[PDB]
């Protein structure tokens, strides 16, 4: 097959900016490119078709381009909502190949989760288990780091983490770490914490509670 | 317009055989090239087969010939991709797409999509378990609250608050498959700590596969 590799990965821009992402073919696949959009939960769509001709309805600010075996999209003017994952794609050849993705996210200011940490529920508690959870709210950027710590000794791999995709009205994630024990173990100690730790939090803040049904 | 729509994805053990369809309105599929792409959860987007109905020829992915057949009936303008020999692998969302002919020889029209989910393990419907305020200390500004919807097979499970009236800072958190094969997920929501008990808060949890709907009512504790 022909293997079309895209670079970058993922990438952050602020509103206003010119950003590129780049396809490169494994072969000469000559003008057989497309170039798709797919925002989450959504089938793709496509914004241009043979290299770099645009597709009815696109916005002007979408452009692609070929140079020997390396296809571009270039989007001028970054609007918030173009928020998505870009693919190409050469239909040169059967199989039709796509390249990996490229997550274009909007870069924003550094804001701070607030914490909140929710102790298990007893109907949850009766089928013996004990699910606390830590609720990270609207936060930038992405990367935070959640900490378990039960009476002070830090919890390793009982812990999941699932993050919210970008709000669109203001650009946050947010995100829930999820310890989850047996109601005989979580009965054995005191103090349930979630130790927070984020870019725009000045010091780790610590939400914790005390167990029990009390 | 010109849609194109699929239809008959779900569960399936493995090593079972499936049909999915793919109706297409506004264009004859005569005319056309029709395909069906995949996508696994999270992963990029992969080619399965491509039919000409005219003269019926068919073209496979190597991890499908053989096990899959890709057909059409002109005359019901709706095509079929027949899936036997399934594997855990085969768990992708199912479009089908035109390639345009006419011009731009890319995919322009894509359907919805179908989830074909290919598992030995059975529908469980979801343990929806509130995650209340006041944890140790009660009131202060913004509170937060929720509900915790756990261990359901397959997906989706859908969640609304108040029945569809609290949309408002309104978070549902991507399911996430815990070790024993079943997901888990949390809708949460953030109020003021003045309505906390003027309020009712309940949380709309429906999981179509089970056929459960659950309605849990979210209110605050002490300790």
């Known amino acids: 097959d022909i293997q079309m590799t895209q670079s970058p990965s993922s990438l952050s821009a602020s509103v206003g900016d010119r950003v590129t992402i780049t396809c490169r073919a494994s072969?000469?696949?000559?003008?057989?490119v497309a170039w798709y959009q797919q925002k989450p939960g959504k089938a793709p769509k496509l914004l241009i078709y043979?290299?770099?001709f645009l597709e009815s309805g696109v916005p002007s600010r979408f452009s692609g381009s070929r140079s020997g075996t390396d296809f571009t999209l270039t989007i001028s003017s970054l609007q918030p909502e173009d928020f998505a994952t870009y693919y190409c794609?050469?239909?040169?050849?059967?199989?039709?190949?796509f390249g990996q993705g490229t997550k274009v996210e909007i870069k924003r200011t550094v804001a701070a989760p607030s914490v909140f940490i929710f102790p298990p529920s007893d109907e949850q508690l009766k089928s013996g288990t004990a699910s606390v959870v830590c609720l990270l709210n609207n936060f930038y950027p992405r990367e935070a780091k959640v900490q378990w710590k039960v009476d002070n000794a830090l919890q390793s791999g009982n812990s999941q983490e699932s993050v919210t995709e970008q709000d669109s009205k203001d650009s946050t994630y947010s995100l829930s770490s999820t310890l989850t024990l047996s109601k005989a173990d979580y009965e054995k100690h005191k103090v349930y914490a979630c130790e927070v730790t984020h870019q725009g939090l000045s010091s780790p803040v610590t939400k914790s509670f005390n167990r029990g049904e009390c | 317009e010109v849609q194109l729509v699929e239809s008959g994805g779900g569960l399936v053990q493995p090593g079972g055989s499936l049909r999915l369809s793919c109706a297409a309105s506004?264009?004859?599929?005569?005319?056309?090239?029709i395909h069906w792409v995949r996508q696994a959860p999270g992963k990029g987007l992969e080619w399965v087969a491509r039919?000409?109905?005219?003269?019926?020829?068919?073209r496979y992915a190597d991890s499908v010939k053989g096990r899959f057949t890709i057909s059409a009936d002109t005359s019901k303008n709706t095509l079929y991709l027949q899936m036997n020999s399934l594997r855990a692998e085969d768990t992708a969302v199912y479009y089908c797409?035109?390639?345009?002919?006419?011009?731009?020889?890319?995919?322009?029209?894509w359907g919805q999509g179908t989830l074909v989910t290919v598992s030995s393990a059975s529908t469980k419907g979801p343990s929806v378990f509130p995650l209340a305020p006041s944890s140790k200390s009660t009131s202060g500004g913004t509170a937060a609250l929720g509900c915790l919807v756990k261990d359901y097979f397959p997906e989706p499970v859908t969640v609304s608050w108040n029945s569809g009236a609290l949309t408002s800072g309104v978070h549902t958190f991507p399911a996430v498959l815990q070790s024993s094969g079943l997901y888990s997920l949390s809708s949460v929501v953030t109020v003021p700590s003045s309505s906390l008990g003027t309020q009712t808060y309940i949380c709309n949890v429906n999981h179509k596969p089970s056929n459960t709907k659950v309605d849990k009512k979210v209110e605050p504790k002490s300790c």
């Open positions: 043979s290299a770099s």
């Open positions: 797409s035109r390639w345009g002919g006419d011009g731009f020889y890319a995919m322009d029209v």
């Open positions: 506004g264009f004859n599929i005569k005319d056309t090239y």
């Open positions: 794609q050469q239909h040169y050849t059967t199989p039709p190949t």
């Open positions: 072969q000469d696949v000559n003008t057989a």
């Open positions: 039919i000409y109905p005219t003269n019926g020829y068919t």
